[PDB]
Structure 1
């Protein structure tokens, strides 16, 4: 079976999240969605750094054409951070847009660029809760003239995103729905339609909640299972097909990104935050970062945001 390695060099995270693999610099970036920190890991050189801000963060993606600059979330603001990748604070912050200026207790959560470079991201109540809590989030993309467009409402916990290689489908996760949805994606108008369930956890006895996700070159989705101690591999060719399961020692698996020189090493983030209604005792909940090899598939380099 696959080899799951705990990356000792990286330590433990409250809620490690938002992994992004920059292929040209062979560097993984990620966030902690509770501790207000960004993180950098260069595996070939065993280099780790962090960056502190005073707002809640949920993604970090290099800005296309601008070395040393990243598109990030700061509470409800999408912003450009100028960061040298090693100092413990940004050099400067350039706000782009506040997606929800008048929803004082919302935050941005998972975000990713589509293959064309357009940032997609969604919101949630800061005090969202599972299985039931306030449902206040929406799904957006950032388009022309730095204005967002809304694509879906009634989202409890806005989470993982992926697109098919032919640019005809988008895949999206609201953790509260305990399923992955597929949509027809119109790359020319940047709109989605014909929402329908692709994979429903209760139909397959999968515990926990879908969180982050990514897609491989064959079109398989790799889905993080929060409170499931696993990642799952699911089909995009047929609905409701579980292809494989890979157990991850940390119960609170949060997200996934392919990396390594050949894009065949799956980085997996997790959360050490101990929750009062957990299916797992506290001794099990640590928050390490893992690397999975031997899956027999390759992914894609992380896409930079175009502004």
Structure 2
């Protein structure tokens, strides 16, 4: 259908969109901002973060959000700012968190990455009521943790290796039976960024350098591709009254001034109606 640039925000690294409280929340990692977009009114709110902020997740029985800062996992509320919840990694790695999801058990799955985007020092983490467990390792840029509606399949992306993996997800939160789900052969400079799983179990993957997003069947076959006037698309997010408005964050990061003049809406927020609803956002169980 028609794609609308609903917020010509020109973010440096728009990322981590979630639908919460009937509005769209997301981040600009590199401008260190949390953004909030109210589609019903067009109202926009922005909050400064004391470090790069990479993901947002709401909390069971509590206000505010748990967020990924470069310095660790924090609680955030607009009224009180940021407070450290826990550190996950040696700061010496020059890592930062990146993408995250909340599964149906209130577990927060989030990745880390080399902030310099060169070292294979990133990991996957599972944060729940039993603590924080390292689930995978040795990945330069992690991305797009997500779970299927039935809770039995978990997807995770190695962006620079152009590969999405699928795992069996057990009821105690353990992973097994890792296998290639999709390896990207869509162009020299096209990499999978963030992904979400829709209500039918199909995977939507935003394309870095691919000017859009691709919907994949549970068997790993592309069924639909959405074009946006922005070379780097970072993550999809289902929102709107019935989770049938697919929002996308995008990024100006990595694009030359010439390319930005050619694609000036890069870094904007885009919305397109789709036929299959997304999954409802889950809240993290912190205690």
- TM bucket (normalised to shorter chain) is over 0.9
**The residue matched to 1:177 in structure 2 has which SS?**
coil
2:191 to 209, 232, 236: 209
Find the counterpart in structure 2 of residue 62 from structure 1.
Answer: 58
Find the counterpart in structure 1 of residue 114 from structure 2.
Answer: 125
> Could you tell me how far 1:107 is from its partner in structure 2?
0.6
> Could you tell me how far 1:205 is from its partner in structure 2?
5.3
Structure 1: how far apart are the matches of 2:230 and 2:267? 6
1:48 to 44, 66, 70: 44
Structure 2: how far apart are the matches of 1:36 and 1:168? 34
Runs of at least 4 residues of structure 1 off by over 4 A? 204-207
Structure 1: how far apart are the matches of 2:201 and 2:71? 32
String of CA shifts for 1:237-262, please: whole Å, max 9, x gaps. Answer: x24x1111111111100001100001
Contiguous gaps of at least 5 residues in structure 2? none
Task: Tell me the TM-score normalised to structure 1 length.
Answer: 0.88
> Could you tell me how far 1:216 is from its partner in structure 2?
1.2
Structure 2: how far apart are the matches of 1:105 and 1:152? 18
Contiguous gaps of at least 5 residues in structure 1? 85-90
Q: Does 1:38 align with 2:44?
A: no
* Aligned counterparts, 1:99-178, within 5 A: 99-128=88-117, 133-144=118-129, 147-178=131-162
Task: Tell me the TM-score normalised to structure 2 length.
Answer: 0.94
Q: Does 1:74 align with 2:69?
A: yes
State the number of aligned residues. 284
> Could you tell me how far 1:44 is from its partner in structure 2?
0.6
Find the counterpart in structure 2 of residue 87 from structure 1.
Answer: none
Find the counterpart in structure 2 of residue 94 from structure 1.
Answer: 83
**Is contact 2:149–2:279 with CA below 8 Å preserved after alignment?**
no
> Could you tell me how far 1:101 is from its partner in structure 2?
2.9
Structure with the bigger percentage of strand: 2
Identify if the C-alpha distance between structure 1 residues 127 and 148 changes in structure 2 by more than 3 Å, giving closer, same or farther. Answer: same
Q: Does 1:196 align with 2:179?
A: yes
> Could you tell me how far 1:206 is from its partner in structure 2?
8.2
String of CA shifts for 1:88-120, please: whole Å, max 9, x gaps. Answer: xxx143311100034341111111111211101
* Aligned counterparts, 1:4-19, within 5 A: 4-8=3-7, 10-19=8-17
Structure 1: how far apart are the matches of 2:160 and 2:188? 14
String of CA shifts for 1:205-262, please: whole Å, max 9, x gaps. Answer: 58511011111111111100011001001111x24x1111111111100001100001
RMSD: 1.8
Find the counterpart in structure 2 of residue 281 from structure 1.
Answer: 259
Find the counterpart in structure 2 of residue 262 from structure 1.
Answer: 242
Structure 2: how far apart are the matches of 1:230 and 1:33? 20
> Could you tell me how far 1:16 is from its partner in structure 2?
0.5
**Is contact 2:194–2:205 with CA below 8 Å preserved after alignment?**
yes
Structure 2: how far apart are the matches of 1:42 and 1:206? 37
**The residue matched to 2:3 in structure 1 has which SS?**
strand
